[PDB]
Design a protein around this ligand. Structure first.
Ligand SMILES: O=C(CCCC(F)(F)F)N1CCC(c2nc(-c3nccs3)no2)CC1
Ligand SMILES: O=C(CCCC(F)(F)F)N1CCC(c2nc(-c3nccs3)no2)CC1
Lengths: 193, 193
C-alpha cells in the first residue's frame, strides 16, 4: 500500500546514481519496485513526479535539520555556529547527490521543481538574514550590506559551489575542502569591513 | 557571404529576448536573416550551433575586456580594482542577457557549451587566484584559504548571482544592487581574517 510508493522512491534514487532521469523509464521504476507499469501510475503521474517527491523529502529533511539547529543553540563561537548551519546542507545534500543533481537539472524543465527550490531558497535566505540582523543588534556584526542582499548572494554561492563539488564539476572546490571554503567566506563577509 | 552569418547571429539574439531556444526554429532564423532554410545550413549545423557561436563571442568579449584590465593597471584602491573586474562580467553579460541565459541552460544539454563555459571559468579562476597570490606576496592580503579554492567559490558565486539577477529569479539580488554585493564579499573574504 504505502510500502510500494516507498519502493518506487527507493528504486528511482538508486537508478539516478547510475544514469539521468531521461534514461530512466517508468517501466524501469515499476520493475525495480516489483509492481507493474499501470500500478506505478496509481502512485505517481510521471517519472518526473517521482523526482519531485524525492527532492521534496531531501529539501524538507535539510529544512528540518536547520530548524533543530535554530531552536537548540549550539554553544560556540560565531565561526562554528555558521559552519554547523552550512554543514546541514553539505551533509543532507551530500548524502543525496543523485537526487540533488537531478533536482537541480529539472529546475529548467519542471515548474513545480523550480518553485519548490524557490520556496526553500527564500526560507533559508530569510533565516540567514534574520540571523545576520540579530548578530548586528548585538554589536557582533557591522552594519555593512543590507542583510538580506548579503544572505541572498552567500546562499547563491553555497548552492552553486556545494552542487558543483558533489557533481565533480570542472571547475569546483574539492568536496573535502568545500565546507571550510564557504565558511571562511561567510564569516569574513558577515563580520568584516 | 560573411554578412549572412552575422544576420543569422543577430536574428537568433533578437528572438531569444522573446522566447527560449526550444521555441525558435531553424526556419524562424532563416526568415529573420533573409535567407532560406537550406542556406542557413550552409552556415550552421543547427540552431544550437548558433547559440554556441553567440555564447562564444560574448565570453570571448568578457575575456578580452578582462585582459585589457590586467595589462593596463587602473590606479586605485584594492576595492575599486576588484569592482572594475567584476564590472567586466556584469556589463558584458548584462548587455547580452538572452544569450547568457540561454547559454547557461544549454550547459545541461550541449557538451560543447558545457566545455566552453568550463574553459573560461577555469581561465578566470586561475587569474583571480594569480591576483590573490600577488596580493599576498605584497603583504596586502593574509594567507588564509588556498587562493585557488577561494577564487573558485567566489567565481561560482558571481556566476549564480549575476545570472540570477539578470533573469529576474526568485530569489535574487536586484540588478542595481548585485555589483556592490559581490564586491563587498570579494573584498572582505580576500583581505579579512
Ligand atoms: O547553506 C545554506 C543554504 C544552502 C542551500 C543549498 F542549496 F544547499 F545551497 N545555508 C542557509 C542558512 C544558513 C544558516 N545557518 C544558520 C544557523 N546555524 C546555526 C545556528 S543558526 N542560520 O542560517 C546556513 C547556510
Ligand atoms: O566575475 C568574474 C568572473 C565571473 C564570470 C561570470 F560568469 F560572469 F560569473 N571575475 C573573474 C576575474 C576577477 C578578477 N578581476 C581581476 C582584476 N580586476 C582589475 C585588475 S585585475 N582579476 O580577476 C573578477 C571577477
Amino acid at each position: 500500500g504505502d510500502d510500494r510508493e516507498l519502493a518506487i522512491l527507493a528504486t528511482a534514487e538508486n537508478l539516478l546514481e547510475d544514469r539521468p532521469l531521461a534514461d530512466i523509464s517508468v517501466d524501469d521504476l515499476a520493475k525495480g519496485a516489483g509492481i507493474s507499469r499501470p500500478t506505478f501510475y496509481f502512485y505517481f503521474p510521471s517519472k518526473e513526479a517521482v523526482l519531485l517527491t524525492l527532492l521534496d523529502r531531501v529539501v524538507n529533511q535539510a529544512d528540518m535539520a536547520l530548524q533543530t539547529l535554530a531552536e537548540n543553540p549550539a554553544d560556540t563561537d560565531r565561526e562554528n555556529m555558521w559552519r554547523t548551519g552550512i554543514n546541514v546542507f553539505f551533509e543532507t545534500f551530500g548524502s543525496h547527490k543523485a537526487v540533488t543533481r537531478a533536482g537541480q537539472a529539472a529546475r529548467a524543465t519542471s515548474v513545480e521543481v523550480a518553485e519548490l527550490w524557490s520556496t526553500f531558497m527564500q526560507k533559508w535566505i530569510a533565516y540567514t538574514a534574520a540571523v545576520i540582523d540579530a548578530e548586528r543588534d548585538r554589536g557582533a556584526a557591522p552594519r555593512t550590506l543590507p542583510a538580506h542582499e548579503l544572505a541572498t548572494a552567500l546562499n547563491l554561492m553555497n548552492e552553486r559551489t556545494l552542487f558543483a563539488s558533489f557533481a565533480g564539476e570542472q571547475p569546483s572546490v574539492p568536496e573535502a575542502r568545500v565546507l571550510d571554503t564557504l565558511v571562511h567566506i561567510w564569516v569574513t563577509s558577515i563580520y568584516g569591513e
